[PDB]
């Protein structure tokens, strides 16, 4: 996870998400997410390793360590793209790039 001497500005948590049934792909459409992947022999279960913010405001005003005198701040969960075996209206099964939660980052705004 992390190390010693330092702290995060924003805190995250991770989880294995096993029941995702629809996501938005890179073309911005809505796609169904298959629950497994057919291999030669045994099918493999399709699930995802996701990570998100513990909270929007770790300390009083927002992100840890920010000059809160001069900025508002917030921990926002960000998404990234991962490949997934998917179908669209049950009809074009294949791999597509989808958005999932992957980190927690700090966003600033001026006071």
């Amino acid at each position: 996870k992390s190390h010693r001497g330092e702290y995060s500005v924003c805190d995250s948590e991770s989880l294995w998400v096993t029941d995702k049934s629809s996501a938005i792909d890179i073309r911005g459409h809505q796609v169904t997410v298959l629950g497994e992947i057919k291999t030669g022999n045994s099918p493999v279960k399709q699930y995802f390793y996701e990570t998100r913010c513990k909270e929007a405001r770790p300390v009083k005003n927002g992100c840890r360590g920010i000059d809160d005198k001069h900025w508002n701040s917030q921990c926002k969960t960000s998404q990234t793209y991962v490949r997934a075996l998917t179908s669209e209206n049950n009809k074009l099964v294949g791999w597509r790039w989808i958005r999932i939660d992957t980190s927690c980052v700090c966003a600033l705004s001026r006071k």
């Binding site: 996870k1 992390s2 805190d11 045994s42 099918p43 699930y47």
Partner: protein, 159 residues
């Protein structure tokens, strides 16, 4: 071939089911039959001519999963967020908190409990948790007159 015999583990005769596979039927009369273990439900982490695929272990209670059960490996569980594996016992206590006036040095890790410090001067901690270091005191600029001076347990407060 092994007509009715069974000469086993590395003794060539009977075949062994490799990693990720388990025995469906042993050396009975015929040769041993392997079937593949089912990803995330079953696993076999052993080469054997007797062992069926084993059921995935479940991380329960004070435990989370940190590596999913896969065809050749049981899940790996670790102590959940907010707990650590306490050597001197089996299980896992809650991570100690850095009380008011004290803040984080080393995070509450795996076998490692929170390590705190009492806040050095010009820093404070007005909370009791296991994730905040001591924060620096608000100083009050020429313009403002503070009431409260900073203290280890509370920031200076200002207008």
């Amino acid at each position: 071939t092994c007509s009715t015999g069974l000469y086993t583990h590395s003794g060539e005769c009977c075949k062994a089911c490799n990693l990720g596979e388990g025995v469906a039927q042993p050396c009975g009369a015929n040769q041993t039959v392997c079937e593949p273990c089912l990803d995330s439900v079953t696993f076999s982490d052993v080469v054997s001519a007797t062992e069926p695929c084993k059921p995935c272990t479940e991380c329960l209670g004070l435990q989370s999963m940190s590596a999913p059960c896969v065809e050749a490996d049981d899940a790996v569980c670790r102590c959940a967020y907010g707990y650590y594996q306490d050597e001197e016992t089996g299980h896992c206590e809650a991570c100690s908190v850095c009380e008011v006036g004290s803040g984080l040095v080393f995070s509450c890790q795996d076998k490692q409990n929170t390590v705190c410090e009492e806040c050095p001067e010009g820093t404070y901690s007005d909370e009791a948790n296991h994730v905040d270091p001591c924060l620096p005191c608000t100083v009050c600029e020429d313009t403002e007159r503070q009431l409260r001076e900073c203290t280890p347990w509370a920031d200076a407060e200002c207008e």
